[PDB]
Amino acid sequence: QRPLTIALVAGETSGDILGAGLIRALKEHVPNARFVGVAGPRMQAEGCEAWYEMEELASRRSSHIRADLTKRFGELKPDVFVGIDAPDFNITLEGNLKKQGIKTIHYVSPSVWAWRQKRVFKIGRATDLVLAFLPFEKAFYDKYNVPCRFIGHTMADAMPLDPDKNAARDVLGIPHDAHCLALLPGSRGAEVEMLSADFLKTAQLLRQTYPDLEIVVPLVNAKRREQFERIKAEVAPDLSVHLLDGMGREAMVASDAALLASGTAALECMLSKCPMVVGYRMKPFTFWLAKRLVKTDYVSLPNLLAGRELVKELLQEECEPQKLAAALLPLLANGKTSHAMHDTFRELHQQIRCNADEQAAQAVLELAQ
Amino acid sequence: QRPLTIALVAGETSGDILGAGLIRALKEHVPNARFVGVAGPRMQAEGCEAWYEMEELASRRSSHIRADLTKRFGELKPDVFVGIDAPDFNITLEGNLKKQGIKTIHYVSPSVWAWRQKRVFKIGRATDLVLAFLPFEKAFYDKYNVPCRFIGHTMADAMPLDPDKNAARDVLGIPHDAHCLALLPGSRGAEVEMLSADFLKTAQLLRQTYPDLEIVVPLVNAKRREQFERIKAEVAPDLSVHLLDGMGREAMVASDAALLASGTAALECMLSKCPMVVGYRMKPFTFWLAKRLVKTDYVSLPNLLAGRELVKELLQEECEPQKLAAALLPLLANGKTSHAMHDTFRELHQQIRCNADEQAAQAVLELAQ
């Protein structure tokens, strides 16, 4: 008898947009359907009962809300719960609801969140289905036997196959006869700081071939804009460019080429049909450490020397005081666990104690003669 | 007739120490040997002629020096050139000297520097032999058929197998009857900022079991010390700890357990025979991006969707204005190269344009009934 009842949780504007589009498409098939949960203004406009505002999630408060929703959705027993992105909140909640027999969907591949294999297994345990924008995301979950549906990317629905370059130039005031370069130094402060100078210097070089080159710089917010302008004042104060408040899509559609920091903004540039070069840089040390972890599952030299988890490594979300304290207590006891580790440390010390100066000296002598 | 002539380049204090030890061990076999190159104060004390000071390398100036050394070592034709660490300077120089028939050794595995396969091939082309401190470093180069000699770690020569815990406590003023915890929040500012609060909170938890726990915090320099104290004032102003200027080795030898940010300081802790827990955290986004690069060789979504280098990606040292400009010029020309990329962009756009809202709506309906 009860009409279709769908629970939804969005945690940011992008999720509110997805949720609103989902509600509209569902109402086309089930006009009497009921929607409830954590809703932004767009979802509420389509009729979603807002037990909580999406703004609240966009933390002690977040934990209490998830606890309340766990109980309330448990009583409601919705036909489906859809966690819209926000994986740090929704994956756990989906697991809580799954435990109670409720059917769950996670919308949007949680790529950043799923940083190791254990997190993949957790998504599979928490969900009945994952909705992925891109085909290689589904191919990934297929390898883990995690039900995943490739649904296409919403931005590809929103952007036409053949954008109007001259129309975008008219919006931005770019002459139609000129070559035009888009510089997108990045949405994150780290990206802007690393790459702004190099991108400006690139534009200076291009001006030597294209002295009338138009340079458009979409800047996502005031902070990043203030950051870019400060760098520019130091690096290329006399380079004339169009600083834009947002309008990245217009800038890309308008331009003849784009220089991008972000391999993810590259998608929108692709949909804009703007040829692009991706230039990105991260701290070499940070990259080396990540690569070592990906390739060996360890970060510490003792475990690499031992070929096993000799010392406890608590990384990312596990680097947390309660877990750290629990790992240290057995060692502070200065008991037999410490003596066993002590003994292994001694054997490994012997394995790399070989009078290195003398070995290097002999390598030199062997090579010289 | 000419006595053994060895060219050396060190670029930091640690390299000067290695160079001095190498010179001493060589003089034991060849007392008349001659040493020349880029030398720190320790190498000079052992007799190394300092064409340039190591301080100069510790950049236009660096480029000129490498050019001068390339010519001068080319005229000198030393029996062996040894690049001591400093790979961003020495690998290229070793390649320059190799081109002239000079025998070259690189001392110390350039793990951070060798961030991709192409850089491994470059080390092999630049060197006749690599000297590696650790066995797994040699196993790595073995896979690439790059001559590498495992020589042991110098720190393992410098530190005894059985350190004196009570002696280290006497230096630091730690009571012998007390449990003692070492907190090493990290030598880098990023590490200190991420982990100091969590490590302090861990110590607070441990105090509830060990109310007399001694807490020693080796801080590598004033900046990092000022950074830690500022964090402490906000997180645990009433937690009493021993702030140390350096003295990490003493703190580890003295302690019953150590909480470490650095998987590399973990080696020194191992040699100190101090049981340890490694707690480390890096930006999830940064880790995700690195992992994607390691696993796919790409960072941008267009190349992941295309399964090839459809768009040019210039990363790390290649993200450089001249290369960026050269990659963009063919695209700004708005010629047939741009039209070919445009056409591929259109096909990929079609492949992910599938009315996602409607697909999500149908997935919900399929699951609900």
Numbering used by the authors:
A (entry chain A), B (entry chain A): 4 to 61, 72 to 382
Any passages from the paper?
LpxB is a glycosyltransferase in the Raetz (lipid A synthesis) pathway that catalyzes nucleophilic attack of the 6′-hydroxyl of lipid X (1) on the anomeric carbon of UDP-diacyl-glucosamine (UDP-DAG) (2) to form β(1–6)-tetraacyl-disaccharide 1-phosphate (lipid A disaccharide) (3). The structure reveals that LpxB has a glycosyltransferase-B family fold but with a highly intertwined, C-terminally swapped dimer comprising four domains.
We identified, and mutated to Ser, six Val and Leu residues (V66, V68, L69, L72, L75, and L76) in a nearby region of the LpxB homology model. These mutations improved solubility and yield of LpxB, and the LpxB with all six mutations (LpxB6S) showed the least aggregation on a size exclusion column. However, the biological assembly is a highly intertwined, C-terminally swapped homodimer. These results demonstrate that LpxB6S remains catalytically competent and suggest that this solubilized form of the enzyme fails to extract lipid substrates from detergent micelles. These results suggest that the hydrophobic patch (V66, V68, L69, L72, L75, and L76) is essential for productive membrane association or substrate binding.
